[PDB]
Design a binder for these strands. Sequence first.
RNA 1: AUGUUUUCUGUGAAAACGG
Length: 153
Amino acid sequence: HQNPQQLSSNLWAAVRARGCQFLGPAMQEEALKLVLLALEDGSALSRKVLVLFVVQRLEPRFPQASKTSIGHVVQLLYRASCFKVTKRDEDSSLMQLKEEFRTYEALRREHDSQIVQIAMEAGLRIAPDQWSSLLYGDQSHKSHMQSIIDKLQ
RNA sequence: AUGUUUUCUGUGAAAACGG
């Protein structure tokens, strides 16, 4: 037994609870684009450079952006196993985008998918129509979301 | 409290500032 704003709040709560975050549809879109920009050529960056790199290009339009918040967003992708991490003896690990995820379509999918797996981990039944609200600020992506939900289940 | 930030090699940890 759960209402719309009961589910949203709980979703964002479980998300924050894993050191992840969603900055609203527009800002999250731009972030992910910058991650690609950074890593589509196969560049390998440490987590810190990566965050900065994004934070810097993003600050102009979204003055809220911080090493912290973007850090979270990166952690979301980290958890969704998009990065091909590479250890270094007592140094920052290096991070690359797995080949499969070097397109936006591909990345944004795996990103969305992860948010859902959290919802699932959290026992939260949300319908495509609402997902498309939550993640894109509109109803233009039910089909997309439905596909994500089905391809997990 | 709700948040916000900071550090870090994090399917994550540890803190600080609001009040």
